[PDB]
mmCIF file of C-alpha atoms and ligand atoms in Angstrom:
data_model
loop_
_atom_site.group_PDB
_atom_site.id
_atom_site.type_symbol
_atom_site.label_atom_id
_atom_site.label_comp_id
_atom_site.label_asym_id
_atom_site.label_seq_id
_atom_site.Cartn_x
_atom_site.Cartn_y
_atom_site.Cartn_z
ATOM 1 C CA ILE A 1 -19.569 -36.447 15.286
ATOM 2 C CA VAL A 2 -19.528 -38.143 12.447
ATOM 3 C CA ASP A 3 -17.007 -41.450 11.831
ATOM 4 C CA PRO A 4 -18.430 -44.314 10.544
ATOM 5 C CA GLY A 5 -16.354 -47.549 10.208
ATOM 6 C CA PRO A 6 -18.253 -50.702 8.803
ATOM 7 C CA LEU A 7 -18.149 -53.801 8.530
ATOM 8 C CA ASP A 8 -17.832 -55.742 5.478
ATOM 9 C CA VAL A 9 -19.350 -59.646 4.852
ATOM 10 C CA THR A 10 -16.157 -61.897 4.193
ATOM 11 C CA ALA A 11 -14.363 -59.343 7.265
ATOM 12 C CA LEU A 12 -17.110 -60.938 8.824
ATOM 13 C CA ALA A 13 -16.722 -64.189 7.470
ATOM 14 C CA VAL A 14 -12.702 -64.342 8.759
ATOM 15 C CA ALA A 15 -14.531 -63.605 12.463
ATOM 16 C CA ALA A 16 -16.791 -66.333 11.832
ATOM 17 C CA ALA A 17 -14.090 -69.058 11.194
ATOM 18 C CA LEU A 18 -11.138 -68.305 12.695
ATOM 19 C CA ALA A 19 -13.665 -68.366 16.298
ATOM 20 C CA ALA A 20 -14.847 -71.158 14.972
ATOM 21 C CA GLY A 21 -11.140 -72.633 14.919
ATOM 22 C CA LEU A 22 -10.430 -72.770 11.961
ATOM 23 C CA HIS A 23 -7.251 -70.711 13.028
ATOM 24 C CA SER A 24 -5.869 -70.423 8.942
ATOM 25 C CA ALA A 25 -9.074 -68.458 7.741
ATOM 26 C CA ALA A 26 -7.704 -65.632 7.109
ATOM 27 C CA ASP A 27 -5.422 -67.094 3.912
ATOM 28 C CA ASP A 28 -8.435 -67.503 1.742
ATOM 29 C CA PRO A 29 -11.211 -65.169 2.426
ATOM 30 C CA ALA A 30 -13.567 -66.009 0.037
ATOM 31 C CA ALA A 31 -13.281 -69.720 1.186
ATOM 32 C CA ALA A 32 -14.318 -68.778 5.269
ATOM 33 C CA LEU A 33 -17.436 -66.614 2.931
ATOM 34 C CA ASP A 34 -18.465 -69.946 0.698
ATOM 35 C CA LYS A 35 -18.291 -72.224 4.423
ATOM 36 C CA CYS A 36 -20.628 -69.342 6.140
ATOM 37 C CA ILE A 37 -24.278 -68.207 5.958
ATOM 38 C CA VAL A 38 -24.856 -64.740 5.787
ATOM 39 C CA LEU A 39 -27.949 -62.178 6.193
ATOM 40 C CA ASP A 40 -26.218 -59.075 4.261
ATOM 41 C CA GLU A 41 -27.342 -55.712 4.196
ATOM 42 C CA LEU A 42 -30.785 -56.322 6.665
ATOM 43 C CA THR A 43 -32.614 -53.582 8.587
ATOM 44 C CA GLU A 44 -34.115 -53.659 12.338
ATOM 45 C CA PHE A 45 -36.825 -51.314 14.152
ATOM 46 C CA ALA A 46 -38.909 -51.631 16.819
ATOM 47 C CA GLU A 47 -42.566 -53.014 16.555
ATOM 48 C CA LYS A 48 -42.715 -52.992 20.504
ATOM 49 C CA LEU A 49 -40.863 -51.461 23.013
ATOM 50 C CA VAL A 50 -42.141 -52.002 26.960
ATOM 51 C CA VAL A 51 -39.124 -49.899 28.773
ATOM 52 C CA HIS A 52 -38.419 -49.909 32.497
ATOM 53 C CA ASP A 53 -37.278 -46.190 33.456
ATOM 54 C CA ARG A 54 -35.365 -45.880 36.352
ATOM 55 C CA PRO A 55 -34.053 -42.540 37.940
ATOM 56 C CA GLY A 56 -31.029 -41.552 36.012
ATOM 57 C CA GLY A 57 -31.163 -44.249 33.037
ATOM 58 C CA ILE A 58 -29.031 -46.284 34.913
ATOM 59 C CA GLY A 59 -30.804 -50.309 35.262
ATOM 60 C CA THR A 60 -33.739 -49.201 33.020
ATOM 61 C CA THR A 61 -34.377 -51.632 31.327
ATOM 62 C CA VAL A 62 -35.971 -52.617 28.345
ATOM 63 C CA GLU A 63 -37.640 -55.774 26.343
ATOM 64 C CA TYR A 64 -38.282 -55.473 22.805
ATOM 65 C CA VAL A 65 -39.312 -57.266 19.048
ATOM 66 C CA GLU A 66 -37.244 -55.686 16.328
ATOM 67 C CA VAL A 67 -37.982 -56.854 12.862
ATOM 68 C CA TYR A 68 -35.736 -58.137 10.642
ATOM 69 C CA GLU A 69 -36.700 -55.548 6.964
ATOM 70 C CA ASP A 70 -34.383 -58.137 3.674
ATOM 71 C CA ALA A 71 -33.031 -54.789 1.402
ATOM 72 C CA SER A 72 -36.375 -55.627 -0.601
ATOM 73 C CA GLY A 73 -37.562 -55.044 1.671
ATOM 74 C CA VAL A 74 -39.641 -58.007 3.021
ATOM 75 C CA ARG A 75 -40.376 -59.799 6.818
ATOM 76 C CA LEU A 76 -37.746 -62.290 7.469
ATOM 77 C CA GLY A 77 -38.588 -62.476 11.006
ATOM 78 C CA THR A 78 -38.187 -60.605 14.913
ATOM 79 C CA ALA A 79 -35.671 -60.210 16.805
ATOM 80 C CA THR A 80 -37.427 -60.415 20.636
ATOM 81 C CA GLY A 81 -34.654 -59.940 23.608
ATOM 82 C CA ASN A 82 -33.655 -58.089 26.476
ATOM 83 C CA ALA A 83 -31.684 -54.503 26.901
ATOM 84 C CA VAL A 84 -30.615 -52.919 29.911
ATOM 85 C CA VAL A 85 -28.150 -49.521 30.798
ATOM 86 C CA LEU A 86 -24.835 -50.068 32.318
ATOM 87 C CA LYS A 87 -23.682 -46.408 32.285
ATOM 88 C CA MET A 88 -25.399 -43.544 30.792
ATOM 89 C CA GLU A 89 -21.848 -40.447 30.853
ATOM 90 C CA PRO A 90 -19.688 -39.839 28.883
ATOM 91 C CA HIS A 91 -21.000 -42.923 26.257
ATOM 92 C CA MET A 92 -24.187 -45.379 27.510
ATOM 93 C CA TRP A 93 -23.729 -48.885 27.023
ATOM 94 C CA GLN A 94 -26.605 -51.393 27.429
ATOM 95 C CA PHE A 95 -25.743 -54.555 27.649
ATOM 96 C CA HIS A 96 -28.331 -57.133 24.398
ATOM 97 C CA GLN A 97 -29.156 -60.384 25.133
ATOM 98 C CA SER A 98 -31.649 -61.214 21.929
ATOM 99 C CA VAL A 99 -33.505 -64.666 20.364
ATOM 100 C CA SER A 100 -33.842 -63.924 16.308
ATOM 101 C CA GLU A 101 -36.779 -66.178 14.452
ATOM 102 C CA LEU A 102 -37.029 -66.503 11.335
ATOM 103 C CA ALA A 103 -38.900 -68.960 9.637
ATOM 104 C CA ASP A 104 -35.889 -71.444 8.597
ATOM 105 C CA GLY A 105 -34.800 -71.153 12.319
ATOM 106 C CA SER A 106 -33.216 -69.345 15.321
ATOM 107 C CA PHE A 107 -29.744 -67.334 17.040
ATOM 108 C CA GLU A 108 -29.223 -65.976 19.913
ATOM 109 C CA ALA A 109 -27.250 -62.746 20.212
ATOM 110 C CA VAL A 110 -25.361 -60.974 23.564
ATOM 111 C CA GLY A 111 -23.513 -58.035 23.443
ATOM 112 C CA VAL A 112 -22.370 -55.161 25.285
ATOM 113 C CA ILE A 113 -22.686 -51.721 22.921
ATOM 114 C CA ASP A 114 -20.982 -48.232 22.851
ATOM 115 C CA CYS A 115 -24.657 -46.305 21.998
ATOM 116 C CA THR A 116 -23.017 -43.275 21.846
ATOM 117 C CA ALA A 117 -20.522 -44.668 19.037
ATOM 118 C CA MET A 118 -24.174 -45.983 17.026
ATOM 119 C CA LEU A 119 -24.609 -42.456 18.102
ATOM 120 C CA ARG A 120 -21.275 -41.397 16.269
ATOM 121 C CA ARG A 121 -22.691 -43.349 13.188
ATOM 122 C CA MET A 122 -19.772 -46.523 14.395
ATOM 123 C CA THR A 123 -20.938 -50.641 13.777
ATOM 124 C CA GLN A 124 -20.860 -52.411 17.095
ATOM 125 C CA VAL A 125 -20.310 -55.732 17.590
ATOM 126 C CA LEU A 126 -22.516 -59.122 19.465
ATOM 127 C CA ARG A 127 -22.012 -62.444 19.435
ATOM 128 C CA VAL A 128 -24.011 -65.080 17.330
ATOM 129 C CA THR A 129 -25.109 -68.483 18.923
ATOM 130 C CA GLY A 130 -27.141 -70.535 15.965
ATOM 131 C CA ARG A 131 -30.547 -72.014 17.301
ATOM 132 C CA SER A 132 -32.398 -73.751 15.398
ATOM 133 C CA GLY A 133 -32.948 -74.679 11.670
ATOM 134 C CA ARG A 134 -29.887 -74.403 9.462
ATOM 135 C CA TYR A 135 -28.286 -72.056 12.333
ATOM 136 C CA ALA A 136 -28.220 -74.971 14.521
ATOM 137 C CA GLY A 137 -24.172 -75.762 15.514
ATOM 138 C CA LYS A 138 -23.087 -72.649 14.163
ATOM 139 C CA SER A 139 -21.585 -69.488 15.508
ATOM 140 C CA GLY A 140 -21.016 -65.903 14.848
ATOM 141 C CA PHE A 141 -20.546 -61.855 14.847
ATOM 142 C CA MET A 142 -23.799 -59.898 14.955
ATOM 143 C CA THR A 143 -23.191 -55.358 12.870
ATOM 144 C CA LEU A 144 -25.687 -52.614 14.077
ATOM 145 C CA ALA A 145 -25.226 -49.219 13.252
ATOM 146 C CA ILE A 146 -27.515 -45.963 12.995
ATOM 147 C CA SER A 147 -29.388 -47.070 9.138
ATOM 148 C CA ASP A 148 -30.409 -43.368 8.812
ATOM 149 C CA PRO A 149 -29.303 -40.602 11.815
ATOM 150 C CA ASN A 150 -32.259 -38.055 11.033
ATOM 151 C CA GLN A 151 -34.493 -41.346 11.632
ATOM 152 C CA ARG A 152 -37.061 -41.947 14.200
ATOM 153 C CA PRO A 153 -37.944 -43.992 15.395
ATOM 154 C CA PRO A 154 -34.272 -45.584 14.629
ATOM 155 C CA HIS A 155 -33.745 -47.882 11.649
ATOM 156 C CA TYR A 156 -30.644 -50.283 12.410
ATOM 157 C CA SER A 157 -28.403 -51.915 9.154
ATOM 158 C CA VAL A 158 -27.199 -55.939 10.477
ATOM 159 C CA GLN A 159 -25.530 -58.346 9.046
ATOM 160 C CA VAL A 160 -24.994 -61.825 10.558
ATOM 161 C CA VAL A 161 -22.287 -64.048 9.576
ATOM 162 C CA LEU A 162 -21.849 -67.825 11.185
ATOM 163 C CA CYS A 163 -20.606 -71.482 10.366
ATOM 164 C CA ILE B 1 -11.127 -36.288 18.008
ATOM 165 C CA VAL B 2 -10.998 -36.790 21.479
ATOM 166 C CA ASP B 3 -14.414 -39.054 23.108
ATOM 167 C CA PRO B 4 -13.909 -41.471 25.894
ATOM 168 C CA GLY B 5 -16.636 -43.751 26.932
ATOM 169 C CA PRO B 6 -15.472 -45.878 29.711
ATOM 170 C CA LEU B 7 -16.943 -48.788 31.876
ATOM 171 C CA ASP B 8 -17.200 -48.023 35.405
ATOM 172 C CA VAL B 9 -16.698 -52.281 36.696
ATOM 173 C CA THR B 10 -20.368 -52.228 38.699
ATOM 174 C CA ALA B 11 -22.073 -52.116 34.742
ATOM 175 C CA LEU B 12 -19.634 -54.884 33.455
ATOM 176 C CA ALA B 13 -20.427 -57.003 36.151
ATOM 177 C CA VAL B 14 -24.012 -56.372 35.764
ATOM 178 C CA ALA B 15 -23.185 -57.544 31.951
ATOM 179 C CA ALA B 16 -20.952 -60.550 33.612
ATOM 180 C CA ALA B 17 -24.632 -61.691 35.786
ATOM 181 C CA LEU B 18 -27.087 -61.110 32.616
ATOM 182 C CA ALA B 19 -24.530 -62.647 30.240
ATOM 183 C CA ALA B 20 -24.861 -65.225 32.536
ATOM 184 C CA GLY B 21 -27.857 -66.143 33.465
ATOM 185 C CA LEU B 22 -28.969 -63.920 36.720
ATOM 186 C CA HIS B 23 -31.429 -62.256 34.630
ATOM 187 C CA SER B 24 -32.007 -59.375 37.870
ATOM 188 C CA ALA B 25 -28.669 -58.146 38.157
ATOM 189 C CA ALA B 26 -29.983 -54.796 37.402
ATOM 190 C CA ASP B 27 -31.827 -54.373 40.178
ATOM 191 C CA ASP B 28 -29.019 -54.143 42.917
ATOM 192 C CA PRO B 29 -25.230 -53.200 41.033
ATOM 193 C CA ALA B 30 -23.775 -53.505 44.163
ATOM 194 C CA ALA B 31 -24.520 -57.426 44.687
ATOM 195 C CA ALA B 32 -23.804 -58.071 40.930
ATOM 196 C CA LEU B 33 -20.173 -56.447 40.909
ATOM 197 C CA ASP B 34 -19.829 -58.895 44.495
ATOM 198 C CA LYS B 35 -20.355 -62.729 42.591
ATOM 199 C CA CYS B 36 -18.097 -61.487 40.310
ATOM 200 C CA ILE B 37 -14.157 -62.285 40.098
ATOM 201 C CA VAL B 38 -12.859 -58.462 39.451
ATOM 202 C CA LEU B 39 -9.654 -57.372 37.708
ATOM 203 C CA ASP B 40 -9.383 -53.509 37.089
ATOM 204 C CA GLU B 41 -7.104 -51.107 37.555
ATOM 205 C CA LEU B 42 -4.061 -53.109 35.617
ATOM 206 C CA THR B 43 -2.091 -52.393 32.074
ATOM 207 C CA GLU B 44 -0.662 -53.882 29.439
ATOM 208 C CA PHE B 45 1.788 -53.624 26.675
ATOM 209 C CA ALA B 46 3.614 -55.245 23.764
ATOM 210 C CA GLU B 47 5.960 -56.979 25.042
ATOM 211 C CA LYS B 48 6.781 -59.186 21.806
ATOM 212 C CA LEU B 49 4.909 -58.269 18.527
ATOM 213 C CA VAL B 50 6.086 -61.224 15.498
ATOM 214 C CA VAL B 51 3.566 -59.476 12.778
ATOM 215 C CA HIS B 52 3.192 -61.214 9.608
ATOM 216 C CA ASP B 53 1.923 -58.827 7.067
ATOM 217 C CA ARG B 54 -0.151 -58.727 4.355
ATOM 218 C CA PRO B 55 0.230 -56.078 1.305
ATOM 219 C CA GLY B 56 -2.931 -54.090 1.576
ATOM 220 C CA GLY B 57 -3.405 -55.183 5.647
ATOM 221 C CA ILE B 58 -5.847 -57.327 5.249
ATOM 222 C CA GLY B 59 -4.710 -60.310 6.993
ATOM 223 C CA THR B 60 -1.679 -59.174 8.596
ATOM 224 C CA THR B 61 -1.623 -61.403 11.078
ATOM 225 C CA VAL B 62 -0.063 -59.672 14.784
ATOM 226 C CA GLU B 63 1.665 -63.261 17.360
ATOM 227 C CA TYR B 64 1.351 -61.165 20.260
ATOM 228 C CA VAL B 65 3.465 -61.265 24.298
ATOM 229 C CA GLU B 66 1.662 -59.122 26.629
ATOM 230 C CA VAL B 67 2.578 -57.468 29.900
ATOM 231 C CA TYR B 68 -0.147 -57.387 32.979
ATOM 232 C CA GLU B 69 1.096 -53.888 35.252
ATOM 233 C CA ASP B 70 -0.762 -53.337 38.523
ATOM 234 C CA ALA B 71 -1.505 -49.029 39.065
ATOM 235 C CA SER B 72 2.256 -49.223 41.477
ATOM 236 C CA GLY B 73 4.040 -50.297 37.759
ATOM 237 C CA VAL B 74 4.498 -54.668 39.722
ATOM 238 C CA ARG B 75 4.243 -57.590 37.114
ATOM 239 C CA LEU B 76 1.381 -59.489 37.078
ATOM 240 C CA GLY B 77 1.379 -61.922 34.194
ATOM 241 C CA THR B 78 1.916 -62.510 30.358
ATOM 242 C CA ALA B 79 -1.370 -62.317 27.812
ATOM 243 C CA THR B 80 -0.260 -64.740 25.180
ATOM 244 C CA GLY B 81 -2.643 -64.181 21.555
ATOM 245 C CA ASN B 82 -2.813 -63.522 17.888
ATOM 246 C CA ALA B 83 -5.195 -60.679 15.746
ATOM 247 C CA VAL B 84 -6.090 -60.778 12.904
ATOM 248 C CA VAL B 85 -6.482 -57.643 10.991
ATOM 249 C CA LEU B 86 -9.653 -57.997 8.797
ATOM 250 C CA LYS B 87 -10.319 -54.377 7.723
ATOM 251 C CA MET B 88 -8.036 -51.863 7.190
ATOM 252 C CA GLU B 89 -10.702 -48.335 5.961
ATOM 253 C CA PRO B 90 -12.462 -46.524 6.998
ATOM 254 C CA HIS B 91 -11.424 -48.213 10.605
ATOM 255 C CA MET B 92 -9.368 -51.613 11.543
ATOM 256 C CA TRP B 93 -10.550 -53.943 12.344
ATOM 257 C CA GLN B 94 -9.444 -56.535 14.605
ATOM 258 C CA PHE B 95 -10.221 -60.271 15.473
ATOM 259 C CA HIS B 96 -8.013 -61.192 18.706
ATOM 260 C CA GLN B 97 -8.041 -64.362 20.746
ATOM 261 C CA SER B 98 -5.345 -64.106 23.839
ATOM 262 C CA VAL B 99 -4.584 -66.776 26.842
ATOM 263 C CA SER B 100 -3.793 -64.106 30.230
ATOM 264 C CA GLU B 101 -1.730 -66.469 32.585
ATOM 265 C CA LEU B 102 -1.421 -64.451 35.784
ATOM 266 C CA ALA B 103 -0.557 -65.593 39.174
ATOM 267 C CA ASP B 104 -4.205 -67.111 40.670
ATOM 268 C CA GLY B 105 -4.458 -68.973 37.611
ATOM 269 C CA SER B 106 -5.229 -67.945 33.814
ATOM 270 C CA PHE B 107 -8.198 -66.835 30.853
ATOM 271 C CA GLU B 108 -8.743 -66.931 27.064
ATOM 272 C CA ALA B 109 -9.754 -63.891 25.571
ATOM 273 C CA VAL B 110 -12.485 -63.564 22.106
ATOM 274 C CA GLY B 111 -13.406 -60.609 20.306
ATOM 275 C CA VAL B 112 -13.344 -58.477 17.213
ATOM 276 C CA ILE B 113 -12.232 -54.825 18.383
ATOM 277 C CA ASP B 114 -12.266 -51.386 16.365
ATOM 278 C CA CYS B 115 -9.069 -50.498 16.418
ATOM 279 C CA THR B 116 -9.397 -46.917 15.076
ATOM 280 C CA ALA B 117 -12.226 -46.012 17.876
ATOM 281 C CA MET B 118 -9.898 -46.940 20.356
ATOM 282 C CA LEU B 119 -7.269 -43.570 18.369
ATOM 283 C CA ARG B 120 -10.569 -41.605 19.587
ATOM 284 C CA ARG B 121 -10.113 -43.465 23.155
ATOM 285 C CA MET B 122 -12.867 -45.500 23.450
ATOM 286 C CA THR B 123 -13.556 -48.151 24.741
ATOM 287 C CA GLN B 124 -13.459 -51.984 23.484
ATOM 288 C CA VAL B 125 -15.124 -55.637 25.218
ATOM 289 C CA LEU B 126 -13.983 -59.089 24.748
ATOM 290 C CA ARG B 127 -15.650 -62.062 25.789
ATOM 291 C CA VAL B 128 -13.684 -63.318 28.759
ATOM 292 C CA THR B 129 -14.133 -67.402 29.776
ATOM 293 C CA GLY B 130 -12.399 -68.447 32.419
ATOM 294 C CA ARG B 131 -9.666 -71.413 32.076
ATOM 295 C CA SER B 132 -7.825 -71.966 35.989
ATOM 296 C CA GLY B 133 -7.396 -70.848 39.165
ATOM 297 C CA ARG B 134 -9.979 -68.757 40.212
ATOM 298 C CA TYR B 135 -10.776 -68.260 37.065
ATOM 299 C CA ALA B 136 -11.621 -71.466 36.315
ATOM 300 C CA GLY B 137 -16.054 -71.983 35.632
ATOM 301 C CA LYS B 138 -16.316 -68.003 34.709
ATOM 302 C CA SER B 139 -17.410 -65.679 31.795
ATOM 303 C CA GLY B 140 -18.200 -62.251 31.661
ATOM 304 C CA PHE B 141 -16.352 -59.110 29.771
ATOM 305 C CA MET B 142 -12.748 -56.757 28.626
ATOM 306 C CA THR B 143 -12.185 -53.570 28.493
ATOM 307 C CA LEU B 144 -9.717 -52.290 26.473
ATOM 308 C CA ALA B 145 -8.464 -48.513 26.228
ATOM 309 C CA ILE B 146 -4.709 -46.923 24.835
ATOM 310 C CA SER B 147 -4.128 -45.276 29.015
ATOM 311 C CA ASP B 148 -1.708 -42.625 27.570
ATOM 312 C CA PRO B 149 -1.491 -43.009 23.511
ATOM 313 C CA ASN B 150 1.813 -40.474 23.128
ATOM 314 C CA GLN B 151 3.612 -42.768 25.988
ATOM 315 C CA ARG B 152 6.052 -45.339 24.487
ATOM 316 C CA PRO B 153 5.318 -48.939 24.372
ATOM 317 C CA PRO B 154 1.602 -47.699 24.136
ATOM 318 C CA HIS B 155 -0.578 -48.391 27.289
ATOM 319 C CA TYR B 156 -4.184 -50.177 27.195
ATOM 320 C CA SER B 157 -6.179 -50.100 30.605
ATOM 321 C CA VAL B 158 -8.035 -53.322 31.089
ATOM 322 C CA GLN B 159 -10.676 -55.039 33.335
ATOM 323 C CA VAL B 160 -12.213 -58.223 33.220
ATOM 324 C CA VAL B 161 -15.040 -59.266 35.069
ATOM 325 C CA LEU B 162 -16.454 -62.308 35.352
ATOM 326 C CA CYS B 163 -18.934 -65.198 37.300
HETATM 327 C C1 LIG C 201 -33.312 -45.605 27.386
HETATM 328 O O1 LIG C 201 -33.687 -46.494 26.374
HETATM 329 C C2 LIG C 201 -32.873 -45.952 25.442
HETATM 330 O O2 LIG C 201 -32.200 -44.228 25.409
HETATM 331 C C3 LIG C 201 -32.553 -46.230 24.280
HETATM 332 C C4 LIG C 201 -31.253 -46.676 23.633
HETATM 333 C C5 LIG C 201 -31.184 -48.022 22.589
HETATM 334 C C6 LIG C 201 -31.867 -48.748 21.774
HETATM 335 C C7 LIG C 201 -31.798 -49.239 20.871
HETATM 336 O O3 LIG C 201 -31.672 -50.849 20.883
HETATM 337 C C8 LIG C 201 -32.116 -51.390 21.951
HETATM 338 O O4 LIG C 201 -33.509 -51.106 21.771
HETATM 339 N N1 LIG C 201 -32.785 -52.497 20.729
HETATM 340 C C9 LIG C 201 -32.570 -52.605 19.069
HETATM 341 C C10 LIG C 201 -32.282 -51.622 18.627
HETATM 342 C C11 LIG C 201 -30.526 -51.518 19.131
HETATM 343 C C12 LIG C 201 -29.323 -52.413 20.024
HETATM 344 C C13 LIG C 201 -30.010 -53.109 19.537
HETATM 345 C C14 LIG C 201 -30.861 -54.307 19.649
HETATM 346 C C15 LIG C 201 -31.382 -55.245 18.519
HETATM 347 O O5 LIG C 201 -32.064 -55.547 17.566
HETATM 348 N N2 LIG C 201 -30.540 -56.265 18.718
HETATM 349 C C16 LIG C 201 -29.315 -56.831 19.353
HETATM 350 C C17 LIG C 201 -30.904 -57.337 17.417
HETATM 351 C C18 LIG C 201 -32.991 -48.409 22.678
HETATM 352 C C19 LIG C 201 -33.297 -47.713 23.492
HETATM 353 C C1 LIG C 202 -0.887 -53.193 11.043
HETATM 354 O O1 LIG C 202 -1.139 -53.292 12.409
HETATM 355 C C2 LIG C 202 -0.317 -53.321 13.552
HETATM 356 O O2 LIG C 202 0.993 -53.762 13.119
HETATM 357 C C3 LIG C 202 -0.708 -53.791 14.733
HETATM 358 C C4 LIG C 202 -2.335 -53.270 15.653
HETATM 359 C C5 LIG C 202 -2.066 -53.152 16.598
HETATM 360 C C6 LIG C 202 -1.579 -53.596 17.513
HETATM 361 C C7 LIG C 202 -1.630 -54.070 19.294
HETATM 362 O O3 LIG C 202 -2.734 -54.667 19.113
HETATM 363 C C8 LIG C 202 -1.741 -55.976 20.101
HETATM 364 O O4 LIG C 202 -0.660 -56.080 19.596
HETATM 365 N N1 LIG C 202 -3.065 -56.788 20.691
HETATM 366 C C9 LIG C 202 -3.281 -56.359 21.730
HETATM 367 C C10 LIG C 202 -3.224 -54.516 22.043
HETATM 368 C C11 LIG C 202 -4.993 -54.281 21.128
HETATM 369 C C12 LIG C 202 -5.697 -54.846 21.482
HETATM 370 C C13 LIG C 202 -5.939 -55.698 22.703
HETATM 371 C C14 LIG C 202 -5.140 -56.401 22.652
HETATM 372 C C15 LIG C 202 -4.379 -57.426 24.512
HETATM 373 O O5 LIG C 202 -3.472 -57.385 24.047
HETATM 374 N N2 LIG C 202 -5.941 -58.730 24.366
HETATM 375 C C16 LIG C 202 -6.856 -58.973 23.828
HETATM 376 C C17 LIG C 202 -4.843 -59.361 25.800
HETATM 377 C C18 LIG C 202 -0.657 -54.474 17.480
HETATM 378 C C19 LIG C 202 -0.290 -54.386 16.093
#
């Protein structure tokens, strides 16, 4: 029950470019990294959770305000969104929609993540759409993973790559 | 090394509805299933594979024709797309882009998938956009998981759910 499988920002850059419509983007990974916005070495933790429980867990909705810290420890901004438990057994799956608000703009994240896989130290991916500032008119992916698995409340390792 | 965690079509219908802008869809899971286009109990397997190998694996492209079968083995159509190996270790990650062609119309799948996690028998999720016929104007998710691992050629359980 321990199986890390991270992505690096270069890999994320190629994913971002391929999906943006730069079909030969794997030819030069460096060139793809260079043309992307990159947020590496982020952690997020919750500052507010509003939980709306349901018997047995399926349909439990969490409104959350998560805080982004950079590698030093500076607050870059918040991720405000909704989690919905789609399923509990044998894996917990949540739907996630979040708007991330930084000083230089905003981007949305949408996805469907296997929370049990994350407890196995695995990485999940959400789809990022730019919404305001330098992120506007760009798109890519966001990685999540449990930062320290013997922490409570849990902290998340986060990368964001758009182009 | 065997940790399954699948998504039922009802859980996928909720996700599709939330992703689509019907924000109360967890209220009545059955009612989200009802406004959704559902393709389930079908499998795919590789018919054509054209790999262009990159030393070290990162950048290996795969051009693929997959064939869809229903639960009684009948061919329903093809999924034609492209994969790129983003990373190999510790987990092999791949970007994917496919156009599925069925009798009742077409849909495009895009996503980044952990191929190692798939060998642990875990489900991966692609985003899906309707392109024609009953799928047109609709979005949602695709799940994949190996059905039987040391079957050859290897087969993947598929669910697609849009609205
Ligand atoms: C019933 O409640 C629970 O058992 C439970 C389970 C898991 C979690 C963790 O997930 C969250 O709440 N939300 C944030 C953190 C992780 C995923 C992404 C998400 C986030 O910041 N994004 C999308 C940027 C919270 C609660
Ligand atoms: C070095 O790596 C390889 O050579 C290699 C590894 C894995 C695979 C299997 O993946 C595929 O070909 N494609 C299909 C199967 C899996 C994901 C879904 C995908 C599919 O049908 N979709 C998205 C409709 C093929 C080649």
